[PDB]
Write a protein that holds these residues in place. Structure first.
Motif, PDB file in Angstrom:
ATOM      1  N   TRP A  37      49.920  -2.172  40.984  1.00  0.00           N
ATOM      2  CA  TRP A  37      50.311  -2.913  41.666  1.00  0.00           C
ATOM      3  C   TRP A  37      49.780  -4.250  41.277  1.00  0.00           C
ATOM      4  O   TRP A  37      49.855  -5.084  40.624  1.00  0.00           O
ATOM      5  CB  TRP A  37      51.022  -3.361  42.904  1.00  0.00           C
ATOM      6  CG  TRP A  37      52.044  -4.917  43.373  1.00  0.00           C
ATOM      7  CD1 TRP A  37      52.511  -5.732  43.327  1.00  0.00           C
ATOM      8  CD2 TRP A  37      53.404  -4.779  42.404  1.00  0.00           C
ATOM      9  NE1 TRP A  37      53.113  -6.768  43.096  1.00  0.00           N
ATOM     10  CE2 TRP A  37      53.904  -6.255  42.535  1.00  0.00           C
ATOM     11  CE3 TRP A  37      53.893  -3.708  41.459  1.00  0.00           C
ATOM     12  CZ2 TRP A  37      54.896  -7.018  41.837  1.00  0.00           C
ATOM     13  CZ3 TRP A  37      55.913  -4.592  41.085  1.00  0.00           C
ATOM     14  CH2 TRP A  37      55.331  -5.422  41.053  1.00  0.00           C
ATOM     15  N   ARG A  38      48.558  -4.329  41.579  1.00  0.00           N
ATOM     16  CA  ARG A  38      47.173  -5.704  41.369  1.00  0.00           C
ATOM     17  C   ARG A  38      47.423  -5.149  39.853  1.00  0.00           C
ATOM     18  O   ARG A  38      46.864  -6.303  39.191  1.00  0.00           O
ATOM     19  CB  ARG A  38      46.125  -5.260  42.400  1.00  0.00           C
ATOM     20  CG  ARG A  38      45.089  -5.924  41.655  1.00  0.00           C
ATOM     21  CD  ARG A  38      45.506  -7.806  42.394  1.00  0.00           C
ATOM     22  NE  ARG A  38      44.455  -8.869  41.985  1.00  0.00           N
ATOM     23  CZ  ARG A  38      43.880  -8.731  42.697  1.00  0.00           C
ATOM     24  NH1 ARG A  38      44.560 -10.156  43.559  1.00  0.00           N
ATOM     25  NH2 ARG A  38      42.872 -10.203  41.731  1.00  0.00           N
ATOM     26  N   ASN A  39      47.528  -3.943  39.298  1.00  0.00           N
ATOM     27  CA  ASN A  39      46.790  -4.437  37.726  1.00  0.00           C
ATOM     28  C   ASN A  39      47.952  -4.060  36.372  1.00  0.00           C
ATOM     29  O   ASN A  39      47.388  -4.533  35.532  1.00  0.00           O
ATOM     30  CB  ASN A  39      45.629  -3.171  38.163  1.00  0.00           C
ATOM     31  CG  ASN A  39      45.035  -3.255  38.703  1.00  0.00           C
ATOM     32  OD1 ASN A  39      43.876  -4.725  38.603  1.00  0.00           O
ATOM     33  ND2 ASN A  39      43.943  -2.726  39.319  1.00  0.00           N
ATOM     34  N   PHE A  40      48.662  -2.969  36.948  1.00  0.00           N
ATOM     35  CA  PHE A  40      49.711  -2.859  35.963  1.00  0.00           C
ATOM     36  C   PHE A  40      51.196  -3.031  36.362  1.00  0.00           C
ATOM     37  O   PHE A  40      52.364  -3.034  35.748  1.00  0.00           O
ATOM     38  CB  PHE A  40      49.723  -1.886  35.334  1.00  0.00           C
ATOM     39  CG  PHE A  40      48.255  -1.585  35.234  1.00  0.00           C
ATOM     40  CD1 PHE A  40      47.716   0.062  36.411  1.00  0.00           C
ATOM     41  CD2 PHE A  40      47.616  -1.402  34.110  1.00  0.00           C
ATOM     42  CE1 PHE A  40      46.736   0.467  36.311  1.00  0.00           C
ATOM     43  CE2 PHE A  40      46.469  -0.654  34.054  1.00  0.00           C
ATOM     44  CZ  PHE A  40      45.782  -0.128  35.006  1.00  0.00           C
ATOM     45  N   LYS A  41      51.653  -3.683  37.632  1.00  0.00           N
ATOM     46  CA  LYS A  41      53.003  -4.243  37.875  1.00  0.00           C
ATOM     47  C   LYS A  41      53.863  -3.019  38.264  1.00  0.00           C
ATOM     48  O   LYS A  41      54.705  -3.331  38.007  1.00  0.00           O
ATOM     49  CB  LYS A  41      53.154  -5.336  37.895  1.00  0.00           C
ATOM     50  CG  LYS A  41      52.434  -7.189  37.958  1.00  0.00           C
ATOM     51  CD  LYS A  41      52.841  -8.139  37.302  1.00  0.00           C
ATOM     52  CE  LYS A  41      52.552  -8.983  37.989  1.00  0.00           C
ATOM     53  NZ  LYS A  41      53.275 -10.556  36.352  1.00  0.00           N
TER      54      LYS A  41
END
Length: 581
Positions: A150-154
């Motif tokens: 979630w932090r990197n590629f949603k």
């Protein structure tokens, strides 16, 4: 006695069979589950799960507890691992675990249900443990990786292990297609008396102009070889989940989720103007086995309709009543249910019938100068057998020539063609591959594919499946940091391990400790990841573009021209570190 099931449909069908001797109750789905946003497993207590009554279900729980004090409370959940865990939760909350209170059946029919209620068994804790281990494995992957992702590629990795393995299949297929180099060749056929033969060559070949002129000039051939043999063809097997999904896709165009939805309706019993009727056996199965009673009914129908010469605890998916024909089923079934029941019925009846028999003639023709040979085969039907029910087309004909005889006239057809790459998967052929490699199981084929499509990790275009930008980028990340753990090989190994836990050949704890060792040794929670790929795209100024990811998601950029945005579900594959849109 009291019987509890999950669904109102099953409850009504069961109550129709048993009458007033049993009170039948539906729980309306799960009563107890792991927490919805607490991790819920205690990694310091050897993977102890933490269960709680699902909000809204407290009253159902109270009713179950009350029933269990008033009489024997029999549990008639479906016969899969999930159903066994449902049975365990009800027994635990009612303090009846260990009693003979679990009813097992593959079909909801009077004969079977009436016998099953008389023969309850103890809950099978190995089966329950296999289910719980699956939940725990999924929860470990899910709660570790979905925040990182979630932090990197949603985006997220629920249904995780199996879902990532299946996504990898689709990406691997796409790279195979990307890398394919077509080769031009000629397809050369000779045609005479309704028969055809293909030119005899070691490999596909592109002939030169003068060779082609010569071949096109052929108007007579000589029979070099003629070999006749008997050929028998086996009837199809009875359906299991995997083959039902595949055939309902290729023959009816049903998505694998629609197939399972309809199959569930046909198994639980459909409400009619007059009562309730079950049409098929349970739809989550890996077995193609048929009960002795059902085999006998099929023999009886075949004998009556076709003649004796046509006659050939998990169970195949098959009609509960083979004498309820597809035509008769139409007064009770909607158009989609009717199509699915018809498919299942024909596959089952055919599977019980004799193999068909043909005489095959394999022949070789040559030119008179001996320069070229052409090979062909033709079939002659001797006995149709199962093909009376399961419709089959075969290359039938006659070979009214002997070795050494000349045939004239002959007509040559020369067609320039190009070799083709492997086709993309369809939902049905992806199921086939998941079965092949051991990564899907009856309860997970359809849900995996549905989730992949719903998350936009793959996209369907004219029934073929393509990887997307987000699917490719997520998969590439998982490959880089979780190589062993997310592999097709490791996913298959875990699924086999869980089968072994169900069968009592491995313990849940040993399986879970192994996974967690492998996972924890590579899991990096604080991973921050700048998306930055070379691409096959170029901007106006001639430069290559690069793929990036920002607050409005994915975009392309070049050190010159403007930035072009891209949807998460645009088609894309990564190969040797470069994204090909």
């Amino acid at each position: 006695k009291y019987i509890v099931v999950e669904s109102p449909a099953k409850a009504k069908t069961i109550k129709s069979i048993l009458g007033n001797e049993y009170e039948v109750f539906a729980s309306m789905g799960h009563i107890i589950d792991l927490p919805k946003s607490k991790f819920g497993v205690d990694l310091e207590k050897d993977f102890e799960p933490e269960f709680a009554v699902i909000k809204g279900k407290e009253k159902v729980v109270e009713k179950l507890k009350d029933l269990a004090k008033k009489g024997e409370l029999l549990i008639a959940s479906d016969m899969d691992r999930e159903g066994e865990a449902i049975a365990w939760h009800i027994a635990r909350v009612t303090n009846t675990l260990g009693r003979k209170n679990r009813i097992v059946f593959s079909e909801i029919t009077p004969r079977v249900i009436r016998e099953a209620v008389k023969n309850p068994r103890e809950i099978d804790m190995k089966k329950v443990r296999a289910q719980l281990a699956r939940r725990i494995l999924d929860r470990i992957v899910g709660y570790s990786l979905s925040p990182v992702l979630w932090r990197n590629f949603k985006s997220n990795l629920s249904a995780g292990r199996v879902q990532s393995a299946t996504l990898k299949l689709v990406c691997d297929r796409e790279r195979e297609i990307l890398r394919f180099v077509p080769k031009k060749y000629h397809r050369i056929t000779v045609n005479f008396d309704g028969l055809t033969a293909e030119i005899d060559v070691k490999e596909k070949k592109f002939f030169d102009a003068e060779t082609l002129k010569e071949i096109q000039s052929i108007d007579e051939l000589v029979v070099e070889e003629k070999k006749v043999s008997v050929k028998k063809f086996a009837p199809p097997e009875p359906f299991k989940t995997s083959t039902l999904q595949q055939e309902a896709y290729s023959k009816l165009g049903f998505s694998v989720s629609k197939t399972m939805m309809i199959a569930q309706q046909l198994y639980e019993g459909v409400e009619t103007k007059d009562g309730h009727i079950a049409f098929i056996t349970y739809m989550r199965t890996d077995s193609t086995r048929v009960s002795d009673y059902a085999k006998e009914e099929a023999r009886n129908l075949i004998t009556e309709v076709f003649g004796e010469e046509y006659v050939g605890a998990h169970e195949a998916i098959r009609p509960t009543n083979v004498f309820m024909t597809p035509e008769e089923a139409g007064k009770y079934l909607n158009s989609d249910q009717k199509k699915l029941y018809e498919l299942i019925w024909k596959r089952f009846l055919a599977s019980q019938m004799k193999p068909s028999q043909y005489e095959e003639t394999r022949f070789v023709l040559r030119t008179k100068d001996g320069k070229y040979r052409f090979k062909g085969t033709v079939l002659k039907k001797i006995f149709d057998g199962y093909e009376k029910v399961w419709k089959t087309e075969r290359n039938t004909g006659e070979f009214p020539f002997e070795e050494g005889e000349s045939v004239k006239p002959v007509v040559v057809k020369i067609e320039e063609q190009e070799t083709k790459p492997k086709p993309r998967y369809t939902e049905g052929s992806l199921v086939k591959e998941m079965e092949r490699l051991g990564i899907g199981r009856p309860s997970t084929y359809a849900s995996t594919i549905k989730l992949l499509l719903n998350r936009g990790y793959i996209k369907k275009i004219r029934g073929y499946l393509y990887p997307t930008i987000v699917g490719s980028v997520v998969m590439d990340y998982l490959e880089k940091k979780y190589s062993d753990v997310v592999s097709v090989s490791f996913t298959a190994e875990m699924e086999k391990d869980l089968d072994e836990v169900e069968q009592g050949k491995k313990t849940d704890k040993i399986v879970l400790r192994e996974f967690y060792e492998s996972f924890s040794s590579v899991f990096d929670r604080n991973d921050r990841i700048v998306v930055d790929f070379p691409t096959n795209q170029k901007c106006s100024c001639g430069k290559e573009m690069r793929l990036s990811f920002g607050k409005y998601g994915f975009y392309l950029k070049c050190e010159c021209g403007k930035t072009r945005s891209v949807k998460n579900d645009e088609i894309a594959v990564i190969d040797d570190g470069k994204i090909f849109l």
